[PDB]
Amino acid sequence: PQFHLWKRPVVTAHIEGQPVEVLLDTGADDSIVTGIELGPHYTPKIVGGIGGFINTKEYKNVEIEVLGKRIKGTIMTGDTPINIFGRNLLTALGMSLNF
Amino acid sequence: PQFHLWKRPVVTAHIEGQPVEVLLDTGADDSIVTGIELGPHYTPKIVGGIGGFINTKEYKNVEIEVLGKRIKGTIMTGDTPINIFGRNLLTALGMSLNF
Ligand SMILES: *[C@@H](CO)COc1ccc([N+](=O)[O-])cc1
Numbered sequence A, B: 001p002q003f004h005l006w007k008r009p010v011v012t013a014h015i016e017g018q019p020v021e022v023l024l025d026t027g028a029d030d031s032i033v034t035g036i037e038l039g040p041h042y043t044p045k046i047v048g049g050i051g052g053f054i055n056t057k058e059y060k061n062v063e064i065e066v067l068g069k070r071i072k073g074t075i076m077t078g079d080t081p082i083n084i085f086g087r088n089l090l091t092a093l094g095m096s097l098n099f
């Protein structure tokens, strides 16, 4: 199945049972979500994007249900204006960019 | 043909004959390049990303050669740390996200 990119490619994902609307982004190496609570077992990171960088909390082996599959992967939480699933997860889901 | 996302999906594009290395990004609505010179016929814009927003120069109907096709589309130039082709162009190229 595939997303045609006329509209933003957005899905609903369950991260540790919490539902979140995420943008699937081939231009992110990482995934970063906000408004989810995931533990005190994190390592601090800073990731950069267009306007500069942000502080994040890297959480490993989180549980994620999306597109009828349950995968485990690294998620960061931080003050992103949009939740994205980077390439770290898109590869876990077998996604390719096709033309 | 398709990109498998184990590596960043990067191509070389010719924009008004200038070669530029670009990241194909399904999470960008817009394309923004730096280090290219494109005219004084632009409209000012500001686009936001992760660390905040940036000032851009929107140029319309620019000439772009990429993946064996010559398309025309809107390109912005501004101080991006990475050059990306947003969804405005990926649709011009018939790209879908497949799984
Ligand atoms: C597309 C979605 O906004 C942009 O992706 C990136 C911007 C900046 C960087 N970086 O500075 O490393 C990577 C990806």
Ligand SMILES: *[C@@H](CO)COc1ccc([N+](=O)[O-])cc1
Pocket (backbone or CB within 6 Å): A025, A027, A028, A049, A081, A082, A084, B025, B027, B028, B029, B048, B049, B050
């Ligand atoms: C993925 C590549 O870095 C991120 O894409 C976006 C970040 C932020 C926004 N926004 O604030 O509208 C859009 C896309």
